[PDB]
């Protein structure tokens, strides 16, 4: 049936991931680097390849699962800065498969995945909107458990990098306040900030 | 049948002799100002129609007060609008500075020059003798402005006196229910705050003048003197007269619904009793005694009168003794 | 069970409090608001509870979800109201800021516009200051107006200690390591005026 | 059987005397930056050991360039480090300017001093003969320069020439592929690019030189010269030497690979037939001409040559009467 990428990137949860080429990833110089970060690395590779595996331990099988997940995770990352990665991400992009800017005034602009770090374990995946150029976090949280660090903290910044004709313009409008049609003057806000401040 | 009918001893005829649209509110075209020219800063007080703010002009920017008019019937908002222009200039009155509108919803809004008042009850725990008298004499210059110019304020209390202490400035401030002067005219009955409710009021006799203003004028003082507050305390509108007849005795009150042969309500039969008139020295206590002198309880009793007719005007109250070391003072 | 405590109960009118019967038995409150729904004196029956009298009574039904949004609008902006949607606010019934940097902060409903019609119920983040769009698709059918431009920052100006800081972090863009130059972000408008 | 040595016939014990730390580039310690100096503007491009941003240092706000490089064995970043380092300063060599380093992922980056380039394109099209022999002066003059300093490019080609035209300014760029020269070292026969890579390279004889680097320059100048890139045009490494083998004839080949005994890969065995040695006025058409002189074909015929020993060091290159009129100029 499927292979193993395909079904990785098609789990629940996974829509952000795009499936790596098998080029990319056979090509050990890509991949540099990755060995002394994954448990069980060579065993994790092959299961990513849809290579034979070595099954007689049922939870040794789980803990490869996992580290090849994890190297799937960290190869992305590295893989959607390169061009065809950002080719892939693009196609995704100009669907809007990485959701919506929540910001009224961002008028549902498509946004990308972004890692706030790029150490595992340490965020989970937030997404950027090249619009106001903020970060957010997913609205589903189908989307709440997969790692930053498979996508990283450069992800949307190389793709403007490579392809700026795709950067949106700055909104035309903003948020203004009123109160019974009154603007809001700013030394409203030291004043609460203090009442708050004193409390 | 037929309530006796009533007319105010002085000025009772100014309003007859003005061009219409001196009283013709409902006819007054409202002119209005940029509303993008003031700024909210923060939340000052609220109310039952009003909500108000401290802001900024931003043309050359000082603070102004934004009293934000909640929906009422566009008539009472001409009412306010008018009185407050009609007055604008006069000794002590709040000066309207501008009037602006929200385009949208249309919510109209009173913009007020600054007033930097001083806490006002925290203020009063420590006026002394001098200051009562002081700060009374100058509520008394706005109430008679602002009824030689045929207007009752109709609600005098002490939240509608703004006081800036330090710099003894005074502004009568709220006119969203004052209302002209008319000879004949029967009034709602239904005014003021329900402790500064004139005996008037509560017997539902309508043909009222400039002379309520000086009920509740009393009722300030009283409640300043005696350091109680406030003064008449009452449950509801009708407990309130009881509380009245309490202090001033159940006899002037039967002699005042007959003078004008006003038909109570047959529910006022059954709980005003008899009660005496007691003597004003009886409220006198060690915390208050240093307010209380006689020309302070003489005055005030000649304010505190179930006949309206009988009360003081506000210039006769500024005759009063009481006053009369302010007036020297005042002299310069 | 009431009227009121039955459309607040409604999936979607979560941001909806329930508005006291004093409120709305005083004429004095709802000024203005025959002038601005249809069928007004069979809706306000409708919503005290009171006897009525086809699709004509589907048609009353509108007219009294109107007139209950309306009255809302005013409700929530005196102390009472406050009080109630305050009390919403701090278990977190109007949902939470996305921002990453805004941490979660609970926000209130705002609406764009004070006209009925114009626009859904949006979400003011105390924090930020900045407006959002429900995630969730059952609040994209409530009206703003029935809000009001005006709520969360009347709520503020009564009590004003509930105001949040301003977020202690930032958002930095960083592309292996490097930050990204301001002249960065202008070329790339450039680039993508050209096409 | 086995191979016979070979030594560089110039600058060969450049690095024998030579403090070790000179060449021993494992054993360099490199000195970090502040990254946080460094803010990026855009892409420049791109290769598999690195990614190239324009960017600028915003504490004197000036541009720079700033080559990402990719995870490699630190031993090949040190290489280059060293060599940027030991050669910065001499003629027509890229400055590094400083190398930084991302605290937390540890991606290294080499910042060198901003050069404006101008494309393939616009310039090699459309450069004058003048113009490709000035150009061609200004490469041997770093080629001399990184010979003498005991370095070989390994890696010489156009998209590692940096050409400022506008200011008549070249870069010889990208040495993570040069190395130190050390006689009798047998070096790695995978390097260069395969349009450029030295019939040495092709056979697998590792016992190379900076000649290496004369042959690539070979076959930049046919290259400028005729209007034809790449000039040798092969499909694989294997095809690469037949393509060259068609133009040089494939005696002087026979003859190379027994001068040097060097042992021919199986699959050469049926492919590379026999061929003449090709006039190089045959690669002359109209399009070319205006390039093409009796200098320029001498010059490139004592580049182009299987035995790495027998083309002109860089130094002898400069001689060449090609130049004559360049070097006649330079000296105003
Ligand atoms: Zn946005
Ligand atoms: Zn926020």
């Known amino acids: 049936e499927v292979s193993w990428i395909s079904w990785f990137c098609g789990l629940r949860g996974n829509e952000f991931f795009c499936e790596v080429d098998e080029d990319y990833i056979q090509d050990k110089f890509n991949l540099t680097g990755l060995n002394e970060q994954v448990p069980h690395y060579r065993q994790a590779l092959d299961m990513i390849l849809d290579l034979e595996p070595d099954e007689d331990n049922p939870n040794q099988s789980d803990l490869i699962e996992q580290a090849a997940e994890m190297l799937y995770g960290l190869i992305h990352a590295r893989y959607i800065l390169t061009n065809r990665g950002i080719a892939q991400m693009l196609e995704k992009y100009q669907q809007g498969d990485f959701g919506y800017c929540p910001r009224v005034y961002c008028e549902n602009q498509p946004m990308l995945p972004i890692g706030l770090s790029d150490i595992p374990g340490e965020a989970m995946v937030k997404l950027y909107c090249p619009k106001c150029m903020d970060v957010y976090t997913p609205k589903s949280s189908r989307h709440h458990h997969t790692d930053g660090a498979y996508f990283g903290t450069g992800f949307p910044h190389m793709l403007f990098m490579v392809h700026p004709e795709y950067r949106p313009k700055r909104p035309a409008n903003q948020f203004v306040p009123r109160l019974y049609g009154f603007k809001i003057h700013p030394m409203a806000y030291q004043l609460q900030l203090q009442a708050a401040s004193n409390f | ?332």
């Open chain 2, 1 to 332: 049948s037929g309530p006796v009918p009533s007319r105010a001893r002085v000025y009772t005829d100014v309003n007859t002799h003005r061009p219409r649209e001196y009283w013709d509110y409902e006819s007054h075209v409202v002119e209005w100002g940029n509303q993008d020219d003031y700024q909210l800063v923060r939340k000052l007080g609220r109310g039952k129609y009003s909500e108000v703010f401290e802001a900024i002009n931003i043309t050359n920017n000082e603070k102004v007060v934004v009293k934000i008019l909640k929906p009422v019937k566009k008539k009472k908002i001409k009412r306010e609008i008018k009185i407050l222009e009609n007055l604008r200039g006069g000794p002590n009155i709040i000066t309207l500075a501008d009037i602006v509108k929200d385009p949208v919803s249309r919510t109209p809004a009173l913009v007020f020059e600054h007033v930097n008042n001083t806490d006002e009850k925290q203020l009063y725990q420590t006026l002394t003798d001098y200051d009562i008298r002081f700060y009374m004499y100058e509520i008394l210059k706005a109430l008679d402005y602002c009824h030689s110019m045929g207007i009752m304020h109709r609600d005098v209390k002490p939240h509608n006196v703004m006081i800036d202490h330090e710099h003894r400035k005074l502004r009568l401030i709220d006119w969203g229910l004052a209302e002209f002067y008319h000879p004949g005219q029967e009034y709602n009955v239904r005014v003021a705050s329900r402790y500064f409710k004139g005996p008037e009021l509560l017997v539902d006799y309508q043909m009222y003048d400039y002379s309520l203003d000086m009920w509740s004028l009393g009722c300030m003082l009283a409640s300043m003197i005696f350091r109680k507050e406030p003064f008449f305390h009452g449950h509801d509108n009708y407990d309130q007269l009881v509380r009245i007849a309490k202090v001033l005795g159940t006899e002037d009150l039967y002699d005042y619904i007959d003078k004008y042969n006003i038909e109570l309500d047959p529910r006022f039969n059954d709980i005003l009793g008899r009660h005496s008139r007691k003597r004003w020295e009886r409220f006198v206590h060690s915390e208050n005694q240093h307010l209380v002198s006689p020309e302070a309880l003489d005055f005030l009793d000649k304010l505190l009168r179930y006949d309206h007719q009988s009360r003081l005007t506000a210039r006769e109250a500024m005759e009063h003794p009481y006053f009369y070391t302010v007036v020297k003072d005042q002299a310069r």
